[PDB]
């Protein structure tokens, strides 16, 4: 199979910037008919991918002329001359020279802004839940930038991976930040056998973990 | 022979110059009045009889070292490498 | 104009099969192949196979041989994909697309969710701070909405009067059931002196729940 690799995974830009993305193939995409079947798509959230450029550099009907593609053999490049708000989304390249047809992993074009440290909030089980035998501790990590973030749960100091459910928001359309929710679910039994519950965030804005804790006491 | 009831294959009717024509979608080429197909860029054994341009197809020419060429259909002259009615 | 109308969202028990449809209109059906493509967050875009509607002949990505079966019906200009013996790996969005050297038009996509659950209302748990908030500070409250099926649940705060400072996190399916959480952030001068309530609706079970967030004691 031909593997398609796209760089970068995330392209933060400000409106009006130029943008450039790379797509490389593991095998030449020149077809025996002379053509090169390398195409670019834009996919916005909740929608299907839409064709932008086909056969390396041909603009699909109706596509704004700020998009241009170039390249040859294995290396290809999509450029956006001046980024607009409607351009944010995930850009996929794909080849239809070789069966099976394959796609790259996508480059996500996103809004750049200044760094923002997450607001971390931790919440113990409600009494409603505890009467059922289950216990969930919830940690929100809200309105942070950049998007990269790591969350570790600690029970009395011991790192715990089982029982953790995580969910991420898309980039906020007003302040360009990201947010995260992390839920650690236990039995009431195990929950009452421990004291310190701690949500620890690793993010660019602090060199040490950002820590919210709750003591059952 | 293009009329209001012609169905343009991978193309569409448009008034160009005086009357109706099938214009190809994307970068396809005319293989006849009402048929648009993919344009190969090389004429060799792997593309024989395939479209190489509007009203042009890759042909195999029988001489010694067998050769291939993009030849216009009957009724057209390759003028500066573009088929145009004779 | 050219239209590819895919069938609605599917909820499928593990081991069952389901058949997806792609109704083509606005072009000559037999002039283009139909491709089907799978999309997941983990594995990205994957070409499933192609079918020539003039002959019904399919060609398959080796990865999906035996998992997918492509047919076409000329009279109705519809392409079908049958997925067989579904596992959790088959949960995805599935697209059909019109292809002639490039896929210029795509369907809107079909959501397939594999789960053994029947319709099930959520449990709705308040998330309230453990400690009182300082003067002129922000307070983050929340609601945990867990153990439901299928999507969607909706969440609002104070019947939608609290809209800024809200983060509703996308639902996550785990062990056949969805979990979702939502946070809201308000000045300490507004809560708990004014009431804050998350309103949860699950239309599939005709469930509507209001959960006032009360301070912990």
Residue numbers in the entry:
A (entry chain L), C (entry chain H): 1 to 217
B (entry chain A): 23 to 108
Which sentences from the paper describe this structure?
A vaccine using Pfs25, a protein on the surface of zygotes and ookinetes, is under investigation as a transmission-blocking vaccine (TBV) that would interrupt parasite passage from mosquitoes to humans. Pfs25 is displayed on the surface of zygotes and ookinetes, two parasite stages found within the mosquito midgut. To better prepare for late-phase clinical trials, a second recombinant Pfs25 protein, called Pfs25M, was produced containing no heterologous amino- or carboxyl-terminal amino acid residues. Pfs25M starts at K23 and terminates at T193 based on the 3D7 Pfs25 sequence. Disulfide bond formation in the four EGF-like domains in Pfs25M and Pfs25H was confirmed by an observed mobility shift by Coomassie blue stained SDS-PAGE under non-reduced versus reduced conditions (raw images in Supplementary Fig. 1) and by intact mass spectrometry.
The 1G2 epitope was found by co-crystallizing Pfs25M with the 1G2 Fab and determining the structure of the complex. The crystal structure revealed that the 1G2 Fab binds to its epitope located in the first and second EGF-like domains of Pfs25M. The 1G2 Fab binds to the two EGF-like domains with its heavy chain (H, green) making contacts with residues of EGF-like domain 1 and its light chain (L, blue) making contacts with EGF-like domain 2. The new C-terminus at N108 is located immediately after domain 2, in the 4-residue loop CIPNEC between C105 of domain 2 and C110 of domain 3. In our crystal, domains 1 and 2 were stable to proteolytic degradation, but domains 3 and 4 were not. The 1G2 epitope is located in a third site on EGF-like domains 1 and 2, distal to the other two regions identified as site 1 and site 2. The 1G2 epitope partially overlaps the reported epitope of the mAb 2530, which is also on domains 1 and 215. The results, which were in agreement with those observed by ELISA, showed a difference in their binding kinetics by a factor of 6.5. The lower Kd for binding 1G2 by Pfs25M, 6.3 × 10−9 M, was indicative of a higher affinity binding when compared to the Kd for binding 1G2 by Pfs25H of 4.1 × 10−8 M.
